[PDB]
C-alpha cells in the first residue's frame, strides 16, 4: 500500500527562519512554482552559511498547489536521508508562504549533462561508460530506497536526476517547478500533460501508478542514459499509432553504446506484464555485478 502524503506528519525540528535565507538564481520554474538557489545562514552549523535549494510557489498558485507543496515537504521528511535522493534540510511553514529547503546539486540535471557529452577514442569511450554504469547504479539504489518506503516517484527521467560533487547522482522531482507546457516531453493525454513516452502502459491506459510502473520508467531512463540524452522513441510523435504500437509490444532497440546486460535490464523493465519486470532491489544487484566485472575490462 503506497503512502498517502497528506497523512504524514510534519516535525518542527525542520523549521528554519526564512529571514536567514538569501535567494539567488532560479534553478527551474513552471506556472505555479520554482526552485531557487539560496544561502542559508546557520542551517547546520550556527556560524556557517551553506548553499541550498528552495522550492516555493508563485502568487498564481491555488489551494491545490499549496497543499501539494506541503505534501512534498511531508514526503521528504518521511523519506529521511539517502545519498541518491535530494535530501530535505529544513522548511519555513510560518511567517509567510511555505518554503521547502533541500540540498543543492552543483552540476544540474543529468539530461543536460548527457546532451553536452554528445555535442562533443576508446579511452574516453571507456571512461564515459564507467560513469554511465555508476549513474545507473546510483539511480537504482535511490529508487530501491523510495520503494522500500512505499513511495512511487511517477516521473522518473534523466531530467529529474541531478549531478553533484563526486559525480554523485540524486533523484529529484522538479514537479511544479517545471514548465511542462513548453516541455515537448510532456504531452496532453486527457486532462493533463503527462510524460507519456516514459510511462508504463497501465499508467497510460488506466492511470495506475505502482512500484512496477516506476521500473518501466527506469528502463526508459536507461535508454536515454546510454543514448547520451536522446529523447526516447526518436521520430515518433505521441498519437494514436504510438499507443497501439506500445500495446502490441513494440519497444525501442538497444542504444548503440549500451552494454548487453544493460540492454537486457531495459527490455525486462518494459515487459507488458508488470509482475515480470524486475524490482529495483533486483536491478541494484544486477548492476553491482556489471560494475564488479568492469574492473576485468580493458
Ligand X SMILES: CCc1cc(NC(=O)Nc2ccc(-c3cnc(Nc4cc(N5C=CN(CC)C=C5)ncn4)s3)cc2)no1
Q: Which residues in this chain contact a second copy in the complex, by CB under 8 A?
A: 37, 50-51, 104, 106-108, 112-113, 116, 120-121, 123-124, 126-127, 130, 165-167, 294-298
- CA end-to-end distance (rounded Å), the chain: 46
Cβ-proximal residues to 114 (8 Å cutoff; 6+ apart), any chain: 158, 224, 225, 228, 229
Told to check if 5 binds ligand X by CB under 6 A, we report no
Cβ-based neighbours of 54, under 8 Å, separated by 6 or more:
21, 23, 35, 36, 37, 38, 99, 100, 101, 102
Q: Tell me if 242 is assigned to a ligand binding site.
A: no
Q: CB of 295: closest distance to a second copy in angstroms?
A: 6
- Nearer to ligand X (CB atom), residue 86 or residue 180: 86
Q: Which of 155, 179, 183, 214 is catalytic?
A: 155
104 is in an annotated binding site: yes
Ranges within 118-137 binding ligand X (CB under 6 A): 122-123
* Residue 214 interacting with ligand X (CB under 6 A): no
Location of C-alpha cell 504510438: 242
Per CB under 6 A, contacts with ligand X among 30-69 are: 35, 53, 55
DSSP 230: P
DSSP string, 252-274: PPPPTTS-HHHHHHHHHHT-SSG
CA 196/CA 219 separation, integer angstroms: 14
Beta strands (DSSP E) in 151-205 are: 161-164, 168-171, 187-189, 192-194
Our CB check for ligand X shows the closer of 122 and 273 to be 122
Active site residue 155: yes
Where are any strands of DSSP class E within the chain? Answer: 21-29, 33-41, 49-57, 88-92, 99-103, 161-164, 168-171, 187-189, 192-194
Residue from 155, 173, 224, 271 that binds ligand X (CB under 6 A)?
173
Which partner in a second copy, ligand X, none is near 120 (CB below 5 to 8 A by kind)? Answer: a second copy
70 to 99: interface string for ligand X, x by CB under 6 A: --x--xx--------xx-------------
144 counts as binding ligand X under rule CB under 6 A: no
273 binding partner (options ligand X, a second copy, none; Cβ < 5 to 8 Å by kind)? none
Q: Is 151 annotated as a binding residue?
A: no
Give the distance, in angstroms, between the CA of residue 258 and the centroid of all CA atoms in the same chain: 21
Binding piece for ligand X, criterion CB under 6 A, among 15-23, 104-112, 131-139, 243-251: 104-112
In the three-class reduction of DSSP (H, G, I as helix; E, B as strand; rest coil), residue 182 is classed as helix
**What region does 163 belong to: left with phi over 0, alpha with psi -120 to 50, or beta?**
beta
Report, in Å, the least distance between residue 99 CB and ligand X: 11
Which residues are marked as active site?
155
Residues of this chain that bind ligand X (CB under 6 A) = 27-28, 35, 53, 55, 72, 75-76, 85-86, 102, 104-105, 108-109, 122-123, 162, 171-174
Amino acid at each position: 500500500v503506497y503512502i498517502d502524503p497528506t497523512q504524514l506528519p510534519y516535525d518542527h525540528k525542520w523549521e528554519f527562519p526564512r529571514n536567514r535565507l538569501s535567494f539567488g538564481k532560479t534553478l527551474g520554474a513552471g506556472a505555479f512554482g520554482k526552485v531557487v538557489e539560496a544561502t542559508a545562514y546557520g542551517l547546520i552549523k550556527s556560524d556557517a552559511a551553506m548553499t541550498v535549494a528552495v522550492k516555493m510557489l508563485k502568487p498564481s498558485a491555488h489551494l491545490t498547489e499549496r497543499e501539494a507543496l506541503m505534501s512534498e515537504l511531508k514526503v521528504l521528511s518521511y523519506l529521511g536521508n539517502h545519498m541518491n535522493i535530494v535530501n530535505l534540510l529544513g522548511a519555513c511553514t510560518i511567517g509567510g508562504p511555505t518554503l521547502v529547503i533541500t540540498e543543492y546539486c552543483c552540476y544540474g540535471d543529468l539530461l543536460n549533462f548527457l546532451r553536452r557529452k554528445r555535442d562533443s577514442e576508446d579511452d574516453e569511450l571507456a571512461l564515459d561508460l564507467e560513469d554511465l554504469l555508476s549513474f545507473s547504479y546510483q539511480v537504482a539504489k535511490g529508487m530501491a530506497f523510495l520503494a522500500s518506503k512505499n513511495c512511487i516517484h511517477r516521473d522518473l527521467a534523466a531530467r529529474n536526476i541531478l549531478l553533484t560533487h563526486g559525480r554523485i547522482t540524486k533523484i529529484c522531482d522538479f514537479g511544479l517547478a517545471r514548465d511542462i507546457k513548453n516541455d515537448s516531453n510532456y504531452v496532453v493525454k486527457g486532462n493533463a500533460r503527462l510524460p507519456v513516452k516514459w510511462m508504463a502502459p497501465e499508467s497510460i491506459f488506466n492511470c495506475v501508478y505502482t512500484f512496477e510502473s516506476d521500473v518501466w520508467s527506469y528502463g526508459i531512463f536507461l535508454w536515454e542514459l546510454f543514448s547520451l540524452g536522446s529523447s526516447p522513441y526518436p521520430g515518433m510523435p505521441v498519437d494514436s499509432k504510438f499507443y497501439k504500437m506500445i500495446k502490441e509490444g513494440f519497444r525501442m532497440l538497444s542504444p548503440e553504446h549500451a552494454p548487453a546486460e544493460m540492454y537486457d535490464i531495459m527490455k525486462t523493465c518494459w515487459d507488458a506484464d508488470p509482475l515480470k519486470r524486475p524490482t529495483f532491489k533486483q536491478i541494484v544487484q544486477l548492476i553491482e555485478k556489471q560494475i564488479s566485472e568492469s574492473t576485468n575490462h580493458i
